[PDB]
């Protein structure tokens, strides 16, 4: 169906919260890699609403601690993700309608992922 | 044979009253397909953002080997591609260039596309290595051409007119078949 | 005596040369038919005063080279400059001649300034017609005093003038 | 095939090459200019290869306007060559690396790769 | 018909017949009987002689018998008198230190031109020529063109500030010996043919 | 010597020989990702696959090559169609979760997984029909990129196929082991505690990923594998 | 009187050196002398890319080149085996005949100038320009088109390219009848050409005259009968041919050709039908530039296809094709690498040439101009 719209402005939204994070602990904030259908996407017309499709926050020593991904533009079974290196932790949220930003059931608020990230960089960083 | 030269003069004489057909350029714009081999352009995105990510494909594709494509990291703050590489320096050799289609062809970002000036004639050979911002679409005409509407203080006034353009050149401003 | 030494008659005979602009092919390739082409019922260039064609070169003041310059042709080519008046111009049309284009070997002359002096350069393949309008008319301009390069300088009336021939 | 003169001295260059070629007649001799960048000649420099078919001739590269006493160097090089008949006048466009390497080769391919590549050069534009 | 004729006559005398799969035939007669072959190839009804083509084999990947090798173009034209319509190429090799071969001009006028070319572009000399001339590469050119010890010779292209290209080193084309960037070539890029 | 047959031809060839060294000796061709010269062949990459008989004795599964001794008498089939179908199959398989940076890859041209992908794959279905290129039409994988191990050495952990090449010549050639995965299935990934990365040999995984992954940080982007001018030289910094 | 007709002059197109022995205003013999335009399309194609030959290929005869296009693309698929769909054939014998026209105006056009009345050089030539504009449609160039691939052609036609096509074919048949109706019925040029050029089959044979001056000469062969390759076979075809080979006979026959090819055209397009436009192969065919953004598999093999191309079997191939100068293939050595081994060029305007000291044998001194345009030279071709 539409959802997949707001997803992928569900997913900017996210970014946000991690941008803000980097100003708070004054840890390094990286963007990993763009769309590949916006490079190459030549004359063809794009709709989506930003063009960065992986960003992480990385440590000290630069190695990541916390990933984010979002599903591109064409391809089967859409959701976004997230993952704690070397941790083996994967977290698959997914966009309810009324309900907002939920991984499976459970909502997925700013706290919560405030939390992780905060965790993860407690426990994880090296320096 | 003899009427034959009568009728060969009876038919020069209908074409001799027949006026038209003929283009006084540059009093009248040449008309010219959307398909045109012309001056190269380089695209952007919506976004703003180069199209050229500096990946070196449109130089392989010349059989002159007359591109040249010096590649550079991009700036995540100010980024000039959307991805990890950019073009530095991209010229290219208009008397090397033989105007194939090939570049445009092996483009996998779509940023350089074949446009549609011709008026290209100058006098120097180091004045026909077309620059980077010598192609730009945001440019509006050619070296000679630009040079002298600053020596001149006449903007620049192209000698063609097309259809329309294509899709491939979205961006690129141009003169639309009487639109205007 | 040149079309100089006066600030009225050297204006006055760079009018008369520019729109007297008599031109002589010496066709050589596929550039040389777009320069045929360009005078047909399309796109004529017999309008600026180019309208004469006098195959012999002893008559005319532009030398059009139109086309790919192969070395075994280097001398003929350049004696019929050699053999010209002297308010005499040259024009290096297409890509083969202006430079050595995609044809990058043995055979090919890689700049045709090499045996006679260019006046103008102008790429294509083949070069619309158009465009060589274009550049009769930015030699038109040239010989007026009237053309600067990219670097703010201004390019003598003749080329050819220029060189000490030998 | 001799080598005369040295490299980045062009009046060495110009004087040991008016000694050694002495009364020799170059009415079928061929000269070529050897240089790199066809268009810039107000720094540029020359080599000289100067093939009379029964023996040849190596001037390194100290010729041309871009070095002191090099422009005067050339003219005065091109005018003797002229002065003793020659009508044959040639130049190479090289990579600056060949330049120098290639008066390094053998004899046999740096004479042929030369003779392969000259252009037919007027004598007006080193004059 | 003519040319099953041809095949019948060259395999009795042990001559090699190759064939590829798409319609092209060759007959290679050694030197000896290369003349007197093709004399009566002219003889059995060959109008029209198409082409000599003349081939060096230095960079080829596989080794051959003689590093040169001339092919005459055989044909009978279906218009004329009567008409088969039977063209096929003779393969002549040709030694690198003997670049002898006699002419088919007394048979053919049509190698007046042609073989002279072969003489321009290959150090192929044609014995018995009435005029063995340069046709093409300049009168003070040394050497012959096409063969592949012979230098193509190429310029660097010009840019702005000392940004100069080499073309023989900006190649990603291969040829056949050239190994490639990787440590090898297999598959594809050894050769490759669909199955129609 | 052992002689071995390969599709046409007979080679001698001596008995500690991989299947795969008499393949190419026999001048035959195969998929070669997870060996390297000097390096402990091991089964990874499986695409070394053969045929194999050994009385016509063919056998049930396909032989890793790179792994496989040689016996007197042996039949080795590349060309069935079964071998290149399984070929092109693995290579779909690898291409699989690739990150789509070729045009901007710093190892362009000279990259294995782009030859041999082109080598072998899409093996040829039977028509003229319309053809899919990847039946792959889900997420990819995604992990850190652009990250630089050393001041040296850059990292893509995306551009992985996970062969064995760095890890392997780490424990064999210098013996320093500053590198290795960190976990396994498909989220497996190279990683480091040593992060200086000390070894005064890590170079030249550089020049064996056969991935853009591990690039050199001095010469990242400056020009394309095959417009870089080559001069073949010998060093002399130290007497070797 | 050994006269040096030199090149380029007095008006001789073509680059081209003529030594005219000449006693009187006889021709004792014409000795004529070539390579001024000697470029090396058969050693600079052993340094390029397959693909890239495509932009090599118009470049000899720049008249007529699709023919060239034709032959290389053919050569090259029986070489690997390409599988060509129809609608691609369709439009590939459309381009050739139409460059078949506008290389027939330019031959007749240069011939009438050359000597005789200037005129009729710009009507023909008028009409060329409308022809030029259909490939500025397609190909965005007048000529030199790099439109023809090795699967068939590069991309599908606009949508404006048929009605002006329609226009030009409804347009051309009171065109060429006239320039038919000013010509066959000589008044002046009876008198110039039927005697002149003497074609006598057998010799023509024996130099190998091919170019459509053969069949001026009573020889009924044409490589689109006798040799069906691009389909020609599947076309309603009149041959027109020549009594006694003329100057006359041949500017006849030629026109007739015009014609004939204006209805090829118009046969070709009404059995047009949409389709496919090249050989998907991906080892042939770069893939499609929408799953550029989509597919790993795209990004390698459009990457690898335009910078390092494909690599055909080790092997040679020859196709015959007619050109508006003759018989025409390209005999192609390849060694398995992306650039062919060798590229020969049967050049027809390389073996028709061997016939002029003949034909302008014992003509008149004026005569030898008109006998040399008659003969339709392009010296792009010859030189080569
Ligand atoms: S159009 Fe020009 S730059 Fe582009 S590939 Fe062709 S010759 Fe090279
Ligand atoms: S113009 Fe296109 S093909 Fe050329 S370097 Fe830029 S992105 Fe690559
Ligand atoms: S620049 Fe192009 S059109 Fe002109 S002679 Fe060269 S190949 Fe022909
Ligand atoms: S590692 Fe190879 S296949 Fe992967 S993006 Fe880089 S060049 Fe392409
Ligand atoms: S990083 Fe490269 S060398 Fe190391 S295991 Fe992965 S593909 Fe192999
Ligand atoms: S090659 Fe044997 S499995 Fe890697």
Same mark, same amino acid.
């Given at each position: 169906?539409?959802?997949?719209?707001?997803?992928?402005?569900?997913?900017?939204?996210?970014?946000?919260?991690?941008?803000?994070?980097?100003?708070?602990?004054?840890?390094?904030?990286?963007?990993?890699?763009?769309?590949?259908?916006?490079?190459?996407?030549?004359?063809?017309?794009?709709?989506?609403?930003?063009?960065?499709?992986?960003?992480?926050?990385?440590?000290?020593?630069?190695?990541?601690?916390?990933?984010?991904?979002?599903?591109?533009?064409?391809?089967?079974?859409?959701?976004?993700?997230?993952?704690?290196?070397?941790?083996?932790?994967?977290?698959?949220?997914?966009?309810?309608?009324?309900?907002?930003?939920?991984?499976?059931?459970?909502?997925?608020?700013?706290?919560?992922?405030?939390?992780?990230?905060?965790?993860?960089?407690?426990?994880?960083?090296?320096? | 044979?003899?009427?034959? #030269?009568?009728?060969?003069?009876?038919? &020069? #004489?209908?074409?001799?009253?027949?006026?038209?057909? &003929?283009?006084?350029?540059?009093?009248?714009?040449?008309?010219?397909?959307?398909?045109?081999?012309?001056?190269?352009?380089?695209?952007?995105?919506?976004?703003? #953002?180069?199209?050229?990510?500096?990946?070196?494909?449109?130089?392989?594709?010349?059989?002159?080997?007359?591109?040249?494509?010096?590649?550079?990291?991009?700036?995540?703050?100010?980024?000039?591609?959307?991805?990890?590489?950019?073009?530095?320096?991209?010229?290219?050799?208009?008397?090397?260039?033989?105007?194939?289609?090939?570049?445009?062809?092996?483009?996998?970002?779509?940023?350089?596309?074949?446009?549609?000036?011709?008026?290209?004639?100058?006098?120097?050979?180091?004045?026909?290595?077309?620059?980077?911002?010598?192609?730009?679409?945001?440019?509006?005409?050619?070296?000679?051409?630009?040079?002298?509407?600053?020596? &001149?203080?006449?903007?620049?006034?192209?000698?063609?007119?097309?259809?329309?353009?294509?899709?491939?050149?979205?961006?690129?401003?141009?003169?639309?078949?009487?639109?205007? | 005596?040149?079309?100089?030494?006066?600030?009225?008659?050297?204006?006055?005979?760079?009018?008369? $040369?520019?729109?007297?602009?008599?031109?002589?092919?010496?066709?050589?390739?596929?550039?040389?038919?777009?320069?045929?082409?360009?005078?047909?019922?399309?796109?004529?260039?017999?309008?600026?005063?180019?309208?004469?064609? $006098?195959?012999?070169?002893?008559?005319?003041?532009?030398?059009?080279?139109?086309? $790919?310059?192969?070395?075994?042709?280097?001398?003929?080519?350049?004696?019929?400059?050699?053999?010209?008046?002297?308010?005499?111009?040259?024009?290096?049309?297409?890509?083969?001649?202006?430079?050595?284009?995609?044809?990058?070997?043995?055979?090919?002359?890689?700049?045709?300034?090499?045996?006679?002096?260019?006046?103008?350069?102008?790429?294509?393949?083949?070069?619309?017609?158009?465009?060589?309008?274009?550049?009769?008319?930015?030699?038109?301009?040239?010989? $007026?005093?009237?053309?600067?390069?990219?670097?703010?300088?201004?390019?003598?009336?003749?080329?050819?003038?220029?060189?000490?021939?030998? | 095939?001799?080598?005369?003169?040295?490299?980045?001295?062009?009046?060495?260059?110009?004087?040991?090459?008016?000694?050694?070629?002495?009364?020799?007649?170059?009415?079928?001799?061929?000269?070529?200019?050897?240089?790199?960048?066809?268009?810039?000649?107000?720094?540029?420099?020359?080599?000289?290869?100067?093939?009379?078919?029964?023996?040849?001739?190596?001037?390194?590269?100290?010729?041309?306007?871009?070095?002191?006493?090099?422009?005067?160097?050339?003219?005065?090089?091109?005018?003797?060559?002229?002065?003793?008949?020659?009508?044959?006048?040639?130049?190479?466009?090289?990579?600056?690396?060949?330049?120098?390497?290639?008066?390094?080769?053998?004899?046999?391919?740096?004479?042929?790769?030369?003779?392969?590549?000259?252009?037919?050069?007027?004598?007006?534009?080193?004059? | 018909?003519?040319?099953?004729?041809?095949?019948? @006559? %060259?395999? %009795?005398?042990?001559?090699?017949?190759?064939?590829?799969?798409?319609?092209?035939?060759?007959?290679?007669?050694?030197?000896?009987?290369?003349?007197? @072959?093709?004399?009566?190839?002219?003889?059995?009804?060959?109008?029209?002689? %198409?082409?000599?083509?003349?081939?060096?084999?230095?960079?080829?990947?596989?080794?051959?018998?003689?590093?040169? =090798?001339?092919?005459? @173009?055989?044909?009978?034209?279906?218009?004329?008198?009567?008409?088969?319509?039977?063209?096929?190429?003779?393969?002549?090799?040709?030694?690198?230190?003997?670049?002898?071969?006699?002419?088919?001009?007394?048979?053919?006028?049509? =190698?007046?031109?042609?073989?002279?070319?072969?003489?321009?572009?290959?150090?192929?000399?044609?014995?018995?020529?009435?005029?063995?001339?340069?046709?093409?590469?300049?009168?003070?050119?040394?050497?012959?063109?096409?063969?592949?010890?012979?230098?193509?010779?190429?310029?660097?292209?010009?840019?702005?500030?000392?940004?100069?290209?080499?073309? =023989?080193?900006?190649?990603?084309?291969?040829?056949?010996?050239?190994?490639?960037?990787?440590?090898?070539?297999?598959?594809?890029?050894?050769?490759?043919?669909?199955?129609? | 010597?052992?002689?071995?047959?390969?599709?046409?031809?007979?080679?001698?060839?001596?008995?500690?020989?991989?299947?795969?060294?008499?393949?190419?000796?026999?001048?035959?061709?195969?998929?070669?990702?997870?060996?390297?010269?000097?390096?402990?062949?091991?089964?990874?990459?499986?695409?070394?696959?053969?045929?194999?008989?050994?009385?016509?004795?063919?056998?049930?599964?396909?032989? *890793?090559?790179?792994?496989?001794?040689?016996?007197?008498?042996?039949?080795?089939?590349?060309?069935?169609?079964?071998?290149?179908?399984?070929?092109?199959?693995?290579?779909?398989?690898?291409?699989?979760?690739?990150?789509?940076?070729?045009?901007?890859?710093?190892?362009?041209? *000279?990259?294995?997984?782009?030859?041999?992908?082109?080598?072998?794959?899409?093996?040829?279905?039977?028509?003229?029909?319309?053809?899919?290129?990847?039946?792959?039409?889900?997420?990819?994988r995604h992990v850190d990129k652009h990250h630089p191990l050393s001041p040296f050495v850059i990292l893509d952990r995306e551009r992985c196929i996970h062969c064995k090449r760095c890890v392997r010549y780490f424990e064999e050639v210098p013996g320093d082991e500053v590198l290795d995965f960190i976990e396994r299935g498909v989220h497996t990934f190279i990683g480091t505690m040593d992060f200086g990365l000390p070894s005064g040999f890590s170079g030249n995984i550089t020049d064996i990923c056969p991935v853009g992954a591990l690039l050199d940080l001095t010469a990242r982007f400056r020009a394309?594998?095959?417009?870089?001018?080559?001069?073949?030289?010998?060093?002399?910094?130290?007497?070797? | 009187?050994?006269?040096?007709?030199?090149?380029?002059?007095?008006?001789?197109?073509?680059?081209?050196?003529?030594?005219?022995?000449?006693?009187?205003?006889?021709?004792?013999?014409?000795?004529?002398?070539?390579?001024?335009?000697?470029?090396?399309?058969?050693?600079?194609?052993? +340094?390029?890319?397959?693909?890239? /030959?495509?932009?090599?290929?118009?470049?000899?005869?720049?008249? +007529?080149?699709?023919? +060239?296009?034709?032959?290389?693309?053919?050569?090259?698929?029986?070489?690997?085996?390409?599988?060509?769909?129809?609608?691609?054939?369709?439009?590939?014998?459309?381009? /050739?005949?139409?460059?078949?026209?506008?290389?027939?105006?330019?031959?007749?056009?240069?011939?009438?100038?050359?000597?005789?009345?200037?005129?009729?050089?710009?009507?023909?030539?008028?009409?060329?320009?409308?022809?030029?504009?259909?490939?500025?449609?397609?190909?965005?160039?007048?000529?030199? +088109?790099?439109?023809?691939?090795?699967?068939?052609?590069?991309?599908?036609?606009?949508?404006?390219?048929?009605?002006?096509?329609?226009?030009?074919?409804?347009?051309?048949?009171?065109?060429?009848?006239?320039?038919?109706?000013?010509?066959?019925?000589?008044?002046?040029?009876?008198?110039?050409?039927?005697?002149?050029?003497?074609?006598?089959?057998?010799?023509?044979?024996?130099?190998?005259?091919?170019?459509?001056?053969?069949?001026?000469?009573?020889? /009924?062969?044409?490589?689109?009968?006798?040799?069906?390759?691009?389909?020609?076979?599947?076309?309603?075809?009149?041959?027109?041919?020549?009594?006694?080979?003329?100057?006359?006979?041949?500017?006849?026959?030629?026109?007739?050709?015009?014609?004939?090819?204006?209805?090829?055209?118009?046969?070709?397009?009404?059995?047009?039908?949409?389709?496919?436009?090249?050989?998907? /192969?991906?080892?042939?065919?770069?893939?499609?530039?929408?799953?550029?953004?989509?597919?790993?598999?795209?990004?390698?093999?459009?990457?690898?296809?335009?910078?390092?191309?494909?690599?055909?079997?080790?092997?040679?191939?020859?196709?015959?094709?007619?050109?508006?100068?003759?018989?025409?293939?390209?005999?192609?050595?390849?060694?398995?690498?992306?650039?062919?081994?060798?590229?020969?060029?049967?050049?027809?305007?390389?073996?028709?040439?061997?016939?002029?000291?003949?034909?302008?044998?014992?003509?008149?001194?004026?005569?030898?101009?008109?006998?040399?345009?008659?003969?339709?030279?392009?010296?792009?071709?010859?030189?080569?």
């Amino acid at each position: 169906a539409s959802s997949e719209r707001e997803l992928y402005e569900a997913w900017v939204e996210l970014l946000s919260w991690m941008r803000e994070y980097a100003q708070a602990k004054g840890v390094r904030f990286e963007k990993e890699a763009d769309f590949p259908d916006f490079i190459y996407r030549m004359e063809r017309p794009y709709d989506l609403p930003t063009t960065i499709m992986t960003a992480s926050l990385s440590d000290g020593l630069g190695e990541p601690f916390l990933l984010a991904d979002v599903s591109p533009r064409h391809a089967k079974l859409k959701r976004i993700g997230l993952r704690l290196p070397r941790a083996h932790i994967h977290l698959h949220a997914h966009y309810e309608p009324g309900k907002g930003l939920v991984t499976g059931k459970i909502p997925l608020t700013k706290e919560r992922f405030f939390a992780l990230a905060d965790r993860a960089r407690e426990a994880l960083a090296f320096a | 044979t003899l009427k034959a #030269l009568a009728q060969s003069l009876g038919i &020069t #004489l209908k074409y001799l009253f027949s006026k038209p057909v &003929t283009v006084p350029y540059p009093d009248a714009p040449v008309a010219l397909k959307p398909r045109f081999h012309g001056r190269h352009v380089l695209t952007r995105h919506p976004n703003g #953002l180069e199209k050229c990510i500096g990946c070196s494909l449109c130089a392989a594709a010349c059989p002159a080997y007359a591109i040249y494509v010096e590649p550079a990291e991009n700036d995540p703050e100010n980024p000039v591609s959307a991805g990890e590489r950019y073009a530095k320096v991209y010229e290219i050799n208009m008397l090397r260039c033989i105007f194939c289609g090939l570049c445009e062809e092996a483009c996998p970002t779509g940023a350089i596309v074949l446009g549609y000036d011709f008026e290209m004639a100058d006098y120097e050979y180091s004045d026909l290595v077309y620059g980077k911002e010598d192609m730009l679409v945001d440019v509006v005409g050619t070296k000679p051409q630009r040079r002298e509407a600053k020596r &001149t203080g006449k903007p620049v006034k192209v000698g063609y007119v097309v259809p329309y353009v294509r899709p491939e050149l979205e961006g690129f401003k141009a003169p639309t078949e009487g639109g205007k | 005596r040149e079309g100089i030494l006066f600030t009225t008659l050297e204006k006055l005979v760079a009018w008369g $040369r520019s729109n007297s602009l008599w031109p002589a092919t010496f066709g050589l390739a596929c550039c040389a038919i777009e320069m045929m082409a360009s005078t047909d019922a399309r796109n004529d260039l017999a309008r600026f005063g180019s309208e004469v064609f $006098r195959a012999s070169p002893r008559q005319a003041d532009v030398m059009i080279v139109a086309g $790919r310059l192969s070395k075994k042709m280097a001398p003929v080519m350049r004696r019929v400059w050699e053999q010209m008046p002297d308010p005499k111009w040259v024009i290096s049309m297409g890509a083969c001649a202006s430079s050595g284009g995609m044809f990058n070997n043995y055979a090919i002359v890689q700049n045709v300034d090499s045996v006679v002096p260019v006046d103008v350069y102008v790429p294509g393949c083949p070069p619309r017609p158009e465009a060589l309008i274009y550049a009769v008319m930015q030699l038109q301009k040239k010989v $007026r005093g009237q053309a600067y390069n990219e670097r703010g300088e201004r390019l003598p009336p003749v080329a050819a003038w220029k060189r000490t021939r030998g | 095939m001799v080598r005369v003169g040295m490299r980045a001295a062009p009046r060495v260059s110009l004087e040991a090459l008016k000694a050694a070629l002495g009364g020799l007649k170059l009415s079928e001799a061929k000269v070529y200019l050897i240089t790199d960048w066809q268009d810039k000649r107000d720094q540029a420099r020359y080599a000289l290869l100067l093939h009379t078919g029964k023996k040849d001739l190596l001037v390194p590269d100290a010729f041309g306007p871009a070095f002191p006493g090099g422009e005067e160097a050339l003219s005065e090089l091109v005018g003797l060559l002229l002065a003793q008949g020659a009508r044959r006048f040639y130049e190479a466009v090289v990579s600056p690396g060949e330049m120098t390497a290639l008066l390094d080769l053998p004899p046999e391919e740096l004479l042929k790769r030369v003779m392969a590549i000259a252009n037919p050069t007027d004598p007006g534009i080193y004059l | 018909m003519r040319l099953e004729r041809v095949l019948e @006559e %060259a395999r %009795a005398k042990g001559y090699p017949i190759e064939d590829n799969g798409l319609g092209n035939l060759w007959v290679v007669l050694p030197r000896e009987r290369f003349k007197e @072959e093709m004399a009566h190839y002219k003889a059995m009804g060959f109008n029209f002689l %198409a082409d000599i083509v003349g081939l060096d084999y230095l960079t080829y990947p596989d080794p051959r018998p003689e590093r040169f =090798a001339v092919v005459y @173009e055989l044909v009978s034209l279906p218009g004329w008198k009567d008409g088969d319509g039977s063209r096929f190429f003779v393969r002549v090799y040709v030694p690198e230190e003997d670049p002898r071969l006699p002419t088919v001009t007394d048979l053919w006028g049509s =190698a007046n031109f042609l073989e002279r070319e072969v003489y321009d572009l290959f150090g192929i000399v044609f014995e018995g020529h009435p005029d063995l001339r340069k046709i093409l590469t300049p009168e003070d050119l040394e050497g012959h063109p096409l063969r592949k010890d012979y230098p193509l010779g190429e310029t660097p292209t010009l840019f702005r500030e000392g940004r100069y290209i080499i073309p =023989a080193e900006f190649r990603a084309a291969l040829t056949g010996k050239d190994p490639g960037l990787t440590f090898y070539k297999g598959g594809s890029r050894k050769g490759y043919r669909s199955l129609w | 010597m052992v002689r071995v047959k390969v599709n046409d031809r007979i080679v001698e060839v001596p008995p500690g020989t991989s299947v795969m060294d008499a393949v190419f000796h026999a001048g035959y061709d195969v998929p070669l990702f997870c060996s390297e010269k000097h390096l402990s062949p091991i089964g990874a990459c499986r695409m070394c696959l053969v045929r194999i008989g050994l009385p016509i004795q063919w056998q049930p599964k396909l032989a *890793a090559s790179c792994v496989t001794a040689v016996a007197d008498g042996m039949v080795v089939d590349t060309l069935s169609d079964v071998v290149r179908e399984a070929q092109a199959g693995m290579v779909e398989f690898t291409l699989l979760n690739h990150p789509l940076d070729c045009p901007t890859c710093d190892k362009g041209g *000279a990259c294995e997984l782009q030859d041999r992908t082109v080598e072998y794959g899409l093996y040829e279905k039977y028509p003229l029909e319309l053809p899919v290129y990847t039946r792959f039409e889900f997420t990819r994988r995604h992990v850190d990129k652009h990250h630089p191990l050393s001041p040296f050495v850059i990292l893509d952990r995306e551009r992985c196929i996970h062969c064995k090449r760095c890890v392997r010549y780490f424990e064999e050639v210098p013996g320093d082991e500053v590198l290795d995965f960190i976990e396994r299935g498909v989220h497996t990934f190279i990683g480091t505690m040593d992060f200086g990365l000390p070894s005064g040999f890590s170079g030249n995984i550089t020049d064996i990923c056969p991935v853009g992954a591990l690039l050199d940080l001095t010469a990242r982007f400056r020009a394309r594998n095959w417009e870089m001018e080559e001069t073949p030289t010998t060093c002399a910094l130290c007497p070797v | 009187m050994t006269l040096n007709v030199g090149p380029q002059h007095p008006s001789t197109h073509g680059v081209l050196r003529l030594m005219v022995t000449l006693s009187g205003e006889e021709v004792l013999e014409v000795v004529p002398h070539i390579g001024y335009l000697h470029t090396g399309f058969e050693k600079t194609m052993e +340094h390029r890319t397959y693909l890239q /030959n495509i932009t090599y290929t118009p470049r000899m005869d720049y008249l +007529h080149s699709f023919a +060239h296009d034709l032959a290389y693309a053919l050569a090259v698929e029986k070489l690997l085996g390409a599988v060509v769909p129809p609608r691609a054939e369709t439009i590939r014998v459309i381009l /050739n005949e139409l460059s078949r026209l506008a290389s027939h105006l330019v031959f007749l056009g240069t011939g009438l100038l050359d000597l005789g009345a200037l005129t009729p050089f710009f009507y023909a030539f008028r009409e060329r320009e409308t022809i030029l504009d259909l490939f500025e449609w397609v190909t965005g160039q007048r000529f030199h +088109h790099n439109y023809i691939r090795i699967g068939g052609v590069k991309e599908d036609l606009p949508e404006e390219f048929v009605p002006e096509l329609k226009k030009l074919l409804e347009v051309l048949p009171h065109r060429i009848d006239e320039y038919e109706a000013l010509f066959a019925e000589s008044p002046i040029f009876y008198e110039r050409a039927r005697g002149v050029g003497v074609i006598p089959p057998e010799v023509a044979i024996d130099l190998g005259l091919t170019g459509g001056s053969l069949r001026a000469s009573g020889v /009924n062969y044409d490589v689109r009968k006798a040799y069906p390759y691009s389909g020609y076979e599947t076309y309603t075809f009149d041959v027109p041919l020549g009594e006694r080979g003329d100057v006359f006979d041949r500017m006849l026959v030629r026109i007739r050709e015009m014609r004939e090819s204006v209805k090829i055209i118009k046969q070709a397009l009404e059995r047009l039908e949409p389709g496919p436009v090249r050989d998907p /192969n991906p080892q042939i065919t770069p893939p499609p530039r929408h799953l550029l953004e989509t597919s790993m598999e795209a990004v390698i093999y459009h990457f690898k296809h335009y910078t390092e191309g494909f690599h055909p079997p080790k092997g040679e191939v020859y196709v015959p094709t007619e050109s508006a100068r003759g018989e025409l293939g390209y005999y192609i050595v390849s060694d398995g690498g992306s650039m062919p081994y060798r590229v020969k060029v049967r050049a027809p305007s390389f073996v028709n040439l061997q016939s002029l000291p003949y034909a302008c044998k014992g003509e008149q001194v004026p005569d030898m101009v008109a006998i040399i345009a008659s003969l339709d030279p392009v010296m792009g071709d010859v030189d080569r």
